[PDB]
Amino acid sequence: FVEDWDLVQTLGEGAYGEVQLAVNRVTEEAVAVKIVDMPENIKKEICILKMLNHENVIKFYGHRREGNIQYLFMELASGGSLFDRIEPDIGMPEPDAQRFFHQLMAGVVYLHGIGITHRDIKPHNLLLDERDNLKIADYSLATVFRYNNRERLLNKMCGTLPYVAPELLKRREFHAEPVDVWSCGIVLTAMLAGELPWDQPSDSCQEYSDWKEKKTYLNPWKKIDSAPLALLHKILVENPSARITIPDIKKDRWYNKPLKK
């Protein structure tokens, strides 16, 4: 009810809906509430949200419906979003970026292990708790890619153009896991350079061509140290069947480099 919760401010607009800081009128407990005006989509999102139990995935509290409105309740992330830790044109200190990337991979390993693909990994959807632990949020595009140990291919275009893998723009059907790996590499670029490399990974985009031609003397690549850049060379591979897998990311030199807080 409008009687149990006070909507204090907008936190943002999700893939499908919008998120308010709600304060409990009785207890003053502060949560995040997703406000959904209108379906089969929301039933599927709630069901995926109920599956989730991991330190690097957002906590789901539950849901209420009142008419053509529905309410989803989640752990309010007191640290806000990763997006707000990225300084435009700078990024953030490499040790902070490595720790976030470790935590991002842990959450993605978890999701992939329960057969879920996120499909919209980007810094707006990566939240931080009071100890700066990263939480993967927004399951509005999430879907099953593995069930009874059998993989299904994706055949729907969605996500955010600067984060989408090139196969999603080109192939009728594609594997879910390499698409989420790609978007994690764009997140890593953003954290280390404070800029996105291209509007979209299409041959008509000059910045994408420049990367395929290995011009890493250009921005954002020249801002990035040789070790993390070597990892990005393995992640941002156009052919998803040649792209590095998460088990191999875990073996990468930069991924395993001790860095000072």
Ligand SMILES: Cc1c(Nc2nc(N)c3c(C#N)c(N4CCC[C@H]4C)n(C)c3n2)cnn1[C@@H]1CCOC1
């Ligand atoms: C406490 C806090 C948050 N905390 C928070 N906690 C969530 N749980 C979500 C959440 C979800 N779920 C979400 N959004 C927006 C739409 C997509 C989704 C990820 N956003 C954006 C969420 N933000 C964000 N800023 N601040 C403060 C106030 C402004 O700066 C610091």
Ligand SMILES: [Cl-]
């Ligand atoms: Cl910006």
Ligand SMILES: [Cl-]
């Ligand atoms: Cl950015």
